[PDB]
Design a protein around this ligand. Structure first.
Ligand SMILES: Cc1cc2nc3c(=O)[nH]c(=O)nc-3n(C[C@H](O)[C@H](O)[C@H](O)COP(=O)(O)OP(=O)(O)OC[C@H]3O[C@@H](n4cnc5c(N)ncnc54)[C@H](O)[C@@H]3O)c2cc1C
Ligand SMILES: NC(=O)C1=CN([C@@H]2O[C@H](COP(=O)(O)OP(=O)(O)OC[C@H]3O[C@@H](n4cnc5c(N)ncnc54)[C@H](O)[C@@H]3O)[C@@H](O)[C@H]2O)C=CC1
Ligand SMILES: O=c1[nH]c(=O)c2[nH]c(=O)[nH]c2[nH]1
Ligand code: FES
Ligand code: FES
Ligand SMILES: [Ca+2]
Length: 1304
């Protein structure tokens, strides 16, 4: 036929005109209106779109359930299946146990990732009602969360595990009843009695054929070799979406029995090419469990690769044949199949051949071997033989769901009874434009014994044979080469052990006992978590929730997918879609724009440019930005214009047909380019105190150095989004925006349009994360959209794709620092001079205020009598960098801790002793002359050092390092001081509006926006105490410019402080009005007083306002307080590094945080954990790469690696400091959002210690100050662990000299 029939949440869908390009995500959200399932990336990496599929499997003869990425699933692949979304399992009226548990355990903050995580856990439970803790963790390999730090999610779900004051109470969790899950649609069970026939779907550009038999597939390939095979679509979906590939004819062979068979033969196991990787995994796990070890070496090699291959959603549909035929150079399976000589069967109409995978199979970049009319039928994965050993290796940026830098399969076969090499095969991915074998090194080794001279001969060969051009795609050439040698060393040592286990230990020899840990397969301990906080007074009423662990008010709705984010709002029938058109050049003249092709796309409306702007094209915080480029473009990502079309698909197609011609201009990309060109934003910023000349002369030692700190992408799970609704009267417009800054959104729109501010209303219900990235940069979408709405008179909507968002909106400022520190032999610091440089990109934005804050925190926790700090902001042809949680603090403080670590090393004293003796005391003045009152940091230090048992663990670390050569541990304890308040004083103001209706219910609003930090929850808690009524009588619906005007951004961690005071004051006004009625009816309920007030004509509405008193610092006189108070905290972390690969484990972290008297210890601990884990990403794994021409390479989760479930400290302890009220802030609390992020430097410095231990083993001296830039990635860790393998790989750097990426 041509009707597409499937089920969604038990309801039958009949699509009479299915378009092959339509994904399930798009169909669910836009056709069925089910917006619980989210778009977070569109590329299989985040899991936000996770849904469950059920089907009757014809081959297994049973109902099966599995999870998929809705963003990648073509609906045309989904004939006769049943889809379940988050809405299908439960809702707020009846939550599923999974939804209840994630909500109540504080595992949902912003909530944008919650439905996908719910669906991952739900699918696991449908497959395994009693999972293990390990199975639960494994369920989320393809899910990301940017807010929670993962800990609460795993803790809540652990309650499901077979083998798994309080923040939450698991005894209150309702039990699971599997009989209450949705029925498998009866019609579908009826339909399995009728045979499957070929189906044909024809779309706008694409024809899709769902083949039922091999005969039909082969005929079609013979007659149309052009036909594109699609099985899982996990490559083709990406090729179509991101590489703009169009395959007009697609054939899906997934129904064909022959491509799905598993056959056990005498030589191995044959898998049909369409077999999902999940099936390959389950089949091989079975075989490994039942067969003797000696037969399963290759099976275990495949399994070791699949362990770190994507997550459950991808492996459910991704085929074994699809990975082979894709033939990416970084395939994880191809080097294993090549090294094992796996047997491939290829077929076409009338032909059949069997081939062995070897070098000839891959004759070029992303090519086989196969003829245009051939398909891969099956692959035989071999049993290993006696004397045959196998290892598989992968090293990436992150263990989980990542692209290999180097991947490898290695096989050795020994002549019987000997340790002489009969066969040897070493195959590599990531070392060429294809999977390659080391065919020049390995023949030289045949007949040799497995010994030290074989080791040295292979390493020397590999280093000569596996050369890389300085400009090789992927970069990291020294690291990649070092890994090939390091992987062979591990295989060499593993084979020695395997020979000993075969009772040839005397022939082969024993392993040095300090070498044994080098061969261990990756394993973690089970997680252990602690949360400590203070109970509220015994006499506090149960209805006073201030200081109580109240769950986020929207947690239940977030878990159910009922909470509404911008793009979940239904479209008006006349709504249009916008797509931005951006510069592909870093600095160029625009010489012409050609929209000829754009105009041919059906649904095209218009292309907006600078000419269409009614009033002003000048925008941005400092008016130095264009709404749309005029005459020139100044970064790759510079917005030139915007296409308007009927649908987002038509807008994307039209935007591709906008052809721009450029004339290149001289580009300034790097901080050095900018120094050389005197290209800066404003003048040097400077803080200086004491006498530097005297300080340096009195110093026993002086140490100079530099540090580079890489930037950071926010990766809020919800990208930037605006809907502009024009009202057709008086210039009136309403914008619904994911923004932290309603005021500037309103102002920038109004100024662009040329209307007063009173015409523009900006509304924000909630954001799926912001982290500073939506403080200003949101407006580049808002203004373009507001313009399209004005021009058309129709509502217009734009949500950015992840690749667009990462390119356009910028991130944290990269920093370069040059320091000189003077100190005594005692470790006492007497003089410090630091020059800071940041890379600001192509507009000023917040850059100068960021540098100010870096300079305010260059002391960190340390008293330094003679200090000079300067900052310069570089003006470059890069997307403009902006606010990011920390706002320059983390960079400033990392530099401080960096030279401090070198002070301790140079003195030969314990680092903790050096830090402690340099720490401020109560009453000291900072370098900017602010007095330190209520200085809790020494308490945080003493409590953390003791509770973490730092000294006893130091002993164990030193012991570990003496007993292990190729793994090292490190341990560090780091303090922090963080000033709370906007550096711009007048921004420290907040407003509220409160209404009491005649039923006694209260509607509260304030200037702060909800982005997952639980601000509305805290404000309700505050108002409930202030009014003395239960939280249940108070509701906050949204943030709006027309309820509270002139609001500061939700930023600087200040929002609870500012809005809390505003809310408190509005509530006090109301109470004052009710007092005469309270005095008359002293016990009569709240509702009586309110009705009495109303009928006496007393106003039940009030504004409230607050400004932080006594702020205002001058850089000129170094006087006045920039901050209202400081936040304090300490963290101790332990790590274990792999010296041979650069991988590491975060073993344990203990945090003690001063949050005053917490408004909400559940939310505050969640903020501590979330901030800490973002810092962990900043300092250890998050890295952005740019071409030498200033083009961002890193445009999605595939290449940009944020912390995953498996990244977090295995033991994770957080304590909130007891008995530390902060009188000056709302109910004695302190701000919490930004201060804990820098604490993750404890991991950076623990890594540095482990490297120092590794370097003490190979090399001359001693207390050498080696370089470690941030982030400390596997590349930087491995390269710093100088040994015999790095030495054979150094060769290169021919000045000068093209490279894949440049450091900005
Ligand atoms: C989030 C994510 C993580 C990933 N992680 C990894 C990883 O860690 N390691 C790794 O190696 N890959 C990884 N991949 C790549 C990808 O998932 C695998 O290559 C997968 O096996 C592709 O299979 P598919 O069925 O989805 O292929 P499809 O996209 O449907 O097709 C891929 C190619 O194979 C061809 N093809 C499929 N079947 C046949 C056939 N039998 N005969 C001839 N040609 C055929 C198609 O025409 C197409 O050219 C990842 C992808 C994603 C999205
Ligand atoms: N999305 C994800 O999270 C993951 C996807 N996969 C795979 O990653 C692939 C990424 O595709 P692309 O971006 O097109 O990368 P690609 O397929 O072009 O491969 C890039 C890599 O190949 C190597 N390479 C290519 N040419 C080279 C040369 N001339 N010299 C030396 N080395 C060279 C380099 O190691 C480089 O990093 C996907 O197709 C997918 O199969 C694998 C892991 C994760
Ligand atoms: O002092 C600050 N000002 C800001 O505007 C801001 N934004 C932010 O995320 N942190 C800070 N800090
Ligand atoms: S939206 Fe599908 S994986 Fe991110
Ligand atoms: S709560 Fe997980 S991304 Fe925000
Ligand atoms: Ca900037």
């Amino acid at each position: 036929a041509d009707e597409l029939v499937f089920f969604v949440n038990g309801k039958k869908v009949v699509e009479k005109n299915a378009d092959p390009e339509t994904t399930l995500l798009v169909y669910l959200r836009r056709k069925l209106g089910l917006c619980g399932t989210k778009l977070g990336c569109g590329e299989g990496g985040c899991g936000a779109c996770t849904v469950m599929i059920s089907k009757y499997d014809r081959l297994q003869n049973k109902i099966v359930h599995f999870s998929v990425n809705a963003c990648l699933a073509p609906i045309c692949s989904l004939h006769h299946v049943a889809v379940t979304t988050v809405e299908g399992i439960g809702n707020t009226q009846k939550l599923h146990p999974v939804q209840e548990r994630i909500a109540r355990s504080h595992g949902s903050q912003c909530g944008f990732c919650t439905p996908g995580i719910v669906m991952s856990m739900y699918t696991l439970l449908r497959n395994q009602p009693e999972p293990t803790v390990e199975e639960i963790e494994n369920a989320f390999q393809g899910n990301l969360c940017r807010c929670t730090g993962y800990r609460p999610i795993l803790q809540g779900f652990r309650t499901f595990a077979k083998d798994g004051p309080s923040l939450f109470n698991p005894e209150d969790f309702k039990p699971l009843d599997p009989t209450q899950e949705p029925i498998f649609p009866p019609e579908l069970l009826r339909l399995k009695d009728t045979p499957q026939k070929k189906l044909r779907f024809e779309g706008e550009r694409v024809t899709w054929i769902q083949a039922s038999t091999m005969e039909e597939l082969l005929d079609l390939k013979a007659q149309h070799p052009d036909a594109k095979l699609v099985v899982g679509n996990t490559e083709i979906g990406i090729e179509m979406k991101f590489k703009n590939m169009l395959f007009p004819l697609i054939v899906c062979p997934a129904w064909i029995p022959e491509l799905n068979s598993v056959v056990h033969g005498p030589e191995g196991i044959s898998f049909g090419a369409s077999c999902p990787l999940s099936l390959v995994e389950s089949v091989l796990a079975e075989e490994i469990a039942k067969l003797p070890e000696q037969k399963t070496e290759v099976f275990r090699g495949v399994m070791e690769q699949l362990r770190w291959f994507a997550g459950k959603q991808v492996k459910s549909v991704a085929s074994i044949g699809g990975n082979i035929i894709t033939a990416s150079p970084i395939s994880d399976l191809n080097p294993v199949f090549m090294a094992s000589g796996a047997k491939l069967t290829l077929v076409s109409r009338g032909t059949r051949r069997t081939v062995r995978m070897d070098h000839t199979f891959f004759p070029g970049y992303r090519k086989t071997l196969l003829r245009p009319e051939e398909i891969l039928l099956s692959i035989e994965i071999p049993y290993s033989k006696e004397g045959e050993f196998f290892s598989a290796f992968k090293q990436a940026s992150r263990r989980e769901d990542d692209i290999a830098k180097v991947t490898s399969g290695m096989r050795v076969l020994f002549k019987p009874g000997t340790i002489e090499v009969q066969e040897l095969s070493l195959c590599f991915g990531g070392m060429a434009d294809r999977t390659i074998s080391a065919l020049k090194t390995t023949p030289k080794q045949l007949s040799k014994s497995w010994n030290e001279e074989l080791l040295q001969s292979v390493c020397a060969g590999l280093a000569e044979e596996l050369q890389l051009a300085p400009d090789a795609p992927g970069g990291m050439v020294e690291f990649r080469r070092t890994l090939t040698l390091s992987f062979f060393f591990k295989f060499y040592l593993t084979v020695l052990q395997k020979l000993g286990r075969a009772d040839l230990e005397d022939m082969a020899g024993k392993l040095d006992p300090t070498f044994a840990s080098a061969t261990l397969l990756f394993q973690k301990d089970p997680p252990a978590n602690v949360q400590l906080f203070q109970e509220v007074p015994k006499d506090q009423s149960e209805e006073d929730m201030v200081g109580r662990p109240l769950p986020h008010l929207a947690a239940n709705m977030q878990a159910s997918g009922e909470a509404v984010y911008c793009d979940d709002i239904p479209r008006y029938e006349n709504e249009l879609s916008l797509r931005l058109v951006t510069s592909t050049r870093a600095h160029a003249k625009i010489t012409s724009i050609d929209t000829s092709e754009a105009k041919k796309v059906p649904g095209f409306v218009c292309f907006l440019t600078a000419e269409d702007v009614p009033n002003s094209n000048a925008t941005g915080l400092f008016n130095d930005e264009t709404v749309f480029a005029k005459d020139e473009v100044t970064c790759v990502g510079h917005i030139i214009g915007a296409v308007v079309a009927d649908t987002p698909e038509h807008a994307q197609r039209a935007a591709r047909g906008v052809k721009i011609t450029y004339e290149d201009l001289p580009a300034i990309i790097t901080i050095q380019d900018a120094i050389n060109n005197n290209s800066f934003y404003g003048s040097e910023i400077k803080i200086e105190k004491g006498d530097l000349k005297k300080g340096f002369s009195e110093a026993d030692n002086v140490v100079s150095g530099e540090l580079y700190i890489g930037g950071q992408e926010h990766f809020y799970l919800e990208t930037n989004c605006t809907i502009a609704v024009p009202k057709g009267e008086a210039g009136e417009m309403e914008l619904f925006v994911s923004t932290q800054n309603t005021m500037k959104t309103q102002s920038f729109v109004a100024k662009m349009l040329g209307v007063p501010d009173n015409r523009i209303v900006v509304r924000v219900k909630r954001m799926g994360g912001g982290f500073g990235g939506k403080e200003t940069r949101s407006t580049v979408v808002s203004t373009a959209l507001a313009l399209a709405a004005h021009k058309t008179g129709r509502p217009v909507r734009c949500m950015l794709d992840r690749d667009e968002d990462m390119l356009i909106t910028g991130g944290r400022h990269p920093f370069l620092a040059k320091y000189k520190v003077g100190f005594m032999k005692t470790g006492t610091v007497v003089a410090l001079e630091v020059a800071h440089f940041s890379n600001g990109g192509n507009t000023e934005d917040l850059s100068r205020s960021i540098m100010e804050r870096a300079l305010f925190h260059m002391d960190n926790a340390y008293k330094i009598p003679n200090i000079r700090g300067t900052g310069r902001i570089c003006k470059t042809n890069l997307p403009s960098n902006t606010a990011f949680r920390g706002f320059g603090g983390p960079q400033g403080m990392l530099i401080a801790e960096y030279w401090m670590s070198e002070v301790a090393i140079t003195c030969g004293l314990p680092a903790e002793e050096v830090r402690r003796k340099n720490m401020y005391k109560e009453g000291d003045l900072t370098h900017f002359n602010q007095k330190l009152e209520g200085f809790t940091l020494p308490r945080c230090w003493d409590e953390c050092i003791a509770s973490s048992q730092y000294l006893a663990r130091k002993r164990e670390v030193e012991k570990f390092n003496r007993e292990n050569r190729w793994k090292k541990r490190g341990l560090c304890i780091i303090p922090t001081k963080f000033g709370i308040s906007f550096t711009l004083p007048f921004l420290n103001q907040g407003g509220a509006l409160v209404h009491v209706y005649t039923d006694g219910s209260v509607l509260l609003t304030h200037g702060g926006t909800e982005m997952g930090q639980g601000l509305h929850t805290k404000m309700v808690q505050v108002a409930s105490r202030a009014l003395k009524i239960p939280t249940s009588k108070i509701h906050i619906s949204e943030t709006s410019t027309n309820t509270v005007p002139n609001t500061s951004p939700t930023a600087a961690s200040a929002s609870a402080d500012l809005n809390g005071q505003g809310v408190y004051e509005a509530c006090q006004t109301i109470l004052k009005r009710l007092e005469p009625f309270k005095k008359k009816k002293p016990t009569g309920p709240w509702e009586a007083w309110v009705m009495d007030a109303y009928t006496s004509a007393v106003s039940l509405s009030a504004t409230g306002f607050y400004k932080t008193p006594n702020l205002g610092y001058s850089f000129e006189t170094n006087s006045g307080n920039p901050f209202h108070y400081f936040s304090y905290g300490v963290a101790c972390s332990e790590v274990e590094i792999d010296c041979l690969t650069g991988d590491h484990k975060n073993l344990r972290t203990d945090i003690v945080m001063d949050v005053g008297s917490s408004l909400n210890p559940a939310i505050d601990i969640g903020q501590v954990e979330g901030a800490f884990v973002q810092g962990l990403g900043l300092f250890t794994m998050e890295e952005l790469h740019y071409s030498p021409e200033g083009s961002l390479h890193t445009r999605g989760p595939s290449t940009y690696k944020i912390p995953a479930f498996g990244s977090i400290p295995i033991e994770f302890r957080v304590s909130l400091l007891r008995d530390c009220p902060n009188k000056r802030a709302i109910y004695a609390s302190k701000a919490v959002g930004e201060p804990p992020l820098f604490l993750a430097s404890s991991i950076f410095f623990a890594i540095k210690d482990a490297i120092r231990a590794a370097r003490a083993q190979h090399g001359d001296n001693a207390k050498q100050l080696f370089q470690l830039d941030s982030p400390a990635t596997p590349e930087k860790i491995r390269n710093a662990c100088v040994d015999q393998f790095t030495t054979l790989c150094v060769t290169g750097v021919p000045e000068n000299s093209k490279s894949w990426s440049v450091r900005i």
